[PDB]
Design a protein around this ligand. Structure first.
Ligand code: SF4
Ligand code: F3S
Ligand code: CL
Ligand code: MG
Ligand code: O
Lengths: 600, 269
């Protein structure tokens, strides 16, 4: 047992294993120890996959890299491609044209919305929503709840909710429960009334049908979703309003189609997703379930993203930096080029360095596998019963910022935005407004509407919690839909003014390149701070290192024994039943773990 | 009773699962609620850990030789199989266990079919396609990174309707979706036939939708339904949106040179 970061870790209690962790992307094992009262007093994050993309890239053409690294992940599809083209463009001093910038931003913001909304409904909701309780709901009371939660959502009739309920009934009564089989239904960890459960299940189904429309924005600009195409120097989707305009990738009709999809997104975020998260968050807040803050209460980081003037970072609409020790009055600048800032340790990871007492900046990064289990393992090399976290216990590296363990993600971006806004940064006004609105809804308006006591939680109290982490994701989805709505107008205006350029090809040919170069590309990816760091030599990739948001959040302990965001978030959480991982899943899922991303 | 599907995930990026849920005809919602019983799937399932693991046993017993095993991703043979760990054991052990009593095995995507990105040189994990590990069961390969949504649901729909695997080509792919090269019906083919090519990104030729052969398009050597069925309810495909096919449904496409290097011997196409 030892203390770190204000957490008293203790592995003497009852050991619980969750393997596989489901409703995530990829492969994770989680172990915890619980005390005599079922409170988690130790947590262990194990990434259970590795593919070695960084190794595979060596010797290849930098222009091809985006397609390889895009296949790090099909859920956060394209964010790696974006990071890669940015890194190569940074290395080779390539400035992309305005339309390429705007198209990439629209693609990025489309991914944010799709990834966030699908995460919440299809991966996260079942940690909050009891689908069997939905079968008991009264359709009229569900209609009434819907009208209170979101007055503008037109799918609100008792008959509509009755029809959905009856389909669920028929499904369950078949005896083939499918994705609901062996669930934790009826646990006291579930607190929603039947009507709220039926509303949420209805929206699960609505979101499942609608999510396929949103990605058609990727399809127009990038050819396909998942895995749209990108390009070093711009975008491939050449523009022609009049000229073979029907055969051109982008004409006015295609742009009108994109706007129609954006407008639908704005309605979904405002009428379905945000109100559901506010309502569910309010009810779990009322139940007192404010666990899961972890490192969000102290240390958060993002690179900063979405400059309303291209290549001018002071205009980032999600402004980044680092906060330490819960001091929201001081945001430190984060520089991905600084060898003393972002570093990765492998002390507790299945890799090898020459010297594992130091962390490597990713321009100097090394990925040599070393799968070996500790002396205190229960089981064998190929049949693990209890992993030994005192030794190497994960395929995830341990990123740190100036040695500090940080949480990344939408919550981090929203805390950073709030801090920036309070210091006078006008570019963060919208997230500040959303947070203040959300706090008023959760504390006063929703309780009033539901006949519950009004509360007086501050943003300092509400945000560093599993509820807060889930809220920030929904707010971010809304904000990204709003931003790309503006980006669309800017794109169309620029094209109509006579700038139709989509690619800078001045340095497409490697005969124009410097014989060596290094570059970095960062992205505010859906789960947090993404970076790709490249070294180029003689036209080829010399080194390519990725540090991915779930690498930060899911990281194992560092050389100093400091815990990462997942492990910290599970600490000090009571479980209703230690053999039912409801609370573990609820909190882990609030980070939206992408394990393929984390390990690459 | 709806046919159980046990959908396993090896080393993968999850693109095939995401593509499946884009299907418009049929809706994935209708597939899950009314066509199959999706009893195990790490992506969507309520149960975790021991409760998730227990489902496999139950379905295998109750529906022995009458469930479909769908596999996304692939098993690694290096690191003693523990570069992909499930329930503390190598994925390859789960794969072999569930495969034994399946009535059919679907290899979703290029990972399961051939290896995909993790199997590109130097293949640090010795990631290996399903058919090299499971050699005594009927397999259908549905390659692509990912495959088209309606191709995935089209395969399922055929299998459920007929209780048969559709006719396969020599490589194990369904002829109903993989009989044509992209280049056969590509709408830019008349430009190819007339020697009208893009030579630099965003040149005048690109703005007129000229053929992408000289920009590395691998459509002439790649079998898929992208030129006809197209992507995301027929909204576009890679070539329509201006990037050459990178060959993503073909075996070993990551190690056939740069995506931007043209095929040699243009006269053969
Ligand atoms: S080379 Fe590619 S773009 Fe040209 S006609 Fe063939 S498939 Fe279409
Ligand atoms: S890259 Fe793949 S998606 Fe189709 S157009 Fe080529 S087979
Ligand atoms: Cl392949
Ligand atoms: Mg890395
Ligand atoms: O993928």
């Amino acid at each position: 047992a030892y203390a770190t970061q204000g957490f008293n870790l203790d592995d003497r209690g009852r050991r619980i294993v969750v393997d596989p962790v489901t409703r995530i992307e990829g492969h994770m094992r989680c172990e915890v120890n619980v005390d005599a009262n079922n409170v988690i007093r130790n947590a262990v994050s194990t990434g259970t996959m590795w593919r070695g993309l960084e190794v595979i890239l060596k010797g290849r053409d930098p222009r091809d890299a985006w397609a390889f690294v895009e296949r790090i992940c099909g859920v956060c599809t394209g964010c790696h491609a974006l990071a890669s083209v940015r890194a190569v463009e940074n290395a080779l001093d390539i400035r992309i044209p305005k339309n390429a910038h705007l198209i990439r931003e629209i693609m990025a913001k489309t991914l944010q919305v799709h990834d966030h909304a699908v995460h919440f409904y299809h991966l996260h909701a079942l940690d909050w929503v009891d689908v069997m309780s939905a079968l008991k709901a009264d359709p009229k009371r569900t209609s009434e709840l819907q009208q209170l939660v979101s007055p503008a959502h037109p799918l609100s009739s008792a008959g509509y909710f009755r029809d959905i309920q009856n389909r669920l009934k028929r499904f369950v009564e078949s005896g083939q429960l499918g994705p609901f089989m062996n669930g934790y239904w009826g646990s006291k960890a579930y607190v929603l009334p039947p009507e709220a459960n039926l509303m949420a299940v209805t929206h699960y189904l609505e979101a499942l049908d609608l999510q396929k429309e949103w990605v058609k924005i990727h399809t127009i600009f990038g050819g396909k979703n998942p895995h749209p195409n990108y390009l070093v120097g711009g975008v491939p989707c050449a523009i022609n309003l009049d000229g073979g305009a029907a055969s051109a990738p982008v004409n006015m009709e295609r742009l009108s189609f994109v706007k129609a999809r954006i407008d639908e997104i704005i309605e979904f975020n405002k009428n379905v997703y945000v109100p559901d998260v506010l309502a569910i968050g309010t009810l779990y807040k009322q139940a007192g379930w404010l666990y899961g803050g972890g490192l969000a209460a102290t240390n958060v980081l993002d690179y900063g993203e979405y400059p309303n003037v291209a290549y001018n970072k002071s205009t980032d609409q999600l402004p980044g930096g680092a906060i330490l020790n819960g001091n929201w009055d001081e945001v430190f600048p984060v520089d991905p080029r600084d060898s003393q800032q972002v570093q990765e340790f492998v002390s507790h990871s299945w890799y090898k360095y020459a010297d594992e007492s130091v962390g490597l900046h990713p321009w100097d990064g090394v990925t040599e596998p070393n799968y070996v289990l500790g002396a205190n393992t229960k089981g064998t090399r190929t049949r693990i019963e209890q992993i030994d976290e005192s030794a190497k216990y994960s395929w995830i590296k341990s990123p740190r910022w100036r040695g500090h363990a940080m949480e990344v993600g939408p919550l981090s971006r929203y805390i950073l935005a709030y801090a920036h806004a309070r210091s006078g940064n006008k570019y963060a006004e919208r997230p500040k407004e959303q947070l203040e609105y959300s706090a008023q809804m959760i504390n006063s308006a929703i309780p009033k509407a539901l006949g519950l006591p009004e509360t007086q939680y501050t943003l300092k109290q509400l945000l560093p919690s599993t509820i807060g982490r889930t809220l920030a994701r929904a707010l971010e989805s809304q904000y990204c839909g709003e931003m790309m709505h503006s980006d669309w107008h800017d794109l169309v205006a620029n094209i109509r003014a006579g700038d139709t350029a989509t690619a800078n090809v001045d340095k497409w040919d490697p005969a124009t390149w410097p014989l060596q170069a290094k570059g970095v590309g960062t992205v505010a990816a859906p789960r947090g701070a993404l970076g790709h760091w490249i070294r180029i030599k003689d036209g080829r990739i010399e080194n390519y290192q990725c540090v991915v948001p779930t690498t930060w959040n899911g990281s194992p302990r560092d050389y100093k024994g400091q815990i990462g965001a997942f492990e910290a978030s599970l600490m000090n959480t009571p479980m209703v039943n230690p053999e039912q991982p409801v609370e573990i899943l609820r909190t882990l899922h609030s980070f939206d773990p992408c394990l393929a991303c984390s390990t690459h | 009773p709806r046919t159980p599907v046990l959908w396993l995930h090896g080393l993968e990026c999850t693109c095939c699962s995401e593509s499946f849920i884009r299907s418009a005809h049929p809706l994935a919602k209708d597939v899950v609620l009314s066509m199959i019983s999706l009893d195990y799937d790490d992506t969507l399932m309520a149960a975790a850990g021991h409760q998730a693991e227990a489902i496999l046993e139950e379905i295998m017993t109750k529906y022995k030789g009458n469930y479909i095993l769908a596999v996304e991703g692939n098993p690694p043979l290096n690191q003693d199989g523990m570069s992909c760990i499930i329930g503390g054991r190598p994925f390859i052990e789960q794969l072999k266990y569930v495969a034994k009593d399946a009535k059919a095995i679907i290899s979703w995507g290029s990972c399961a079919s051939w290896g995909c990105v993790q199997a590109a040189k130097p293949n640090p994990t010795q990631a290996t396609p399903v058919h090299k590990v499971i050699t005594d069961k009927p397999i259908i390969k549905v390659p692509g990174c990912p495959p088209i949504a309606e191709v995935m649901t089209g395969v399922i729909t055929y299998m459920l309707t007929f209780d048969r695997i559709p006719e396969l080509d020599r490589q194990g792919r369904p002829k109903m979706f993989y009989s044509q090269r992209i280049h056969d019906k590509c709408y830019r083919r008349p430009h190819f036939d007339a020697g009208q090519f893009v030579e630099e990104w965003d040149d005048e030729s690109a703005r007129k939708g000229f053929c992408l052969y000289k920009m590395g398009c691998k459509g002439p050597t790649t079998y898929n339904a992208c030129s006809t069925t197209r992507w995301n309810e027929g909204t576009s495909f890679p070539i329509q949106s201006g990037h050459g096919c990178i060959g993503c449904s073909e075996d070993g496409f990551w190690d056939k040179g740069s995506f931007y290097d043209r095929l040699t011997g243009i006269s053969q196409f």
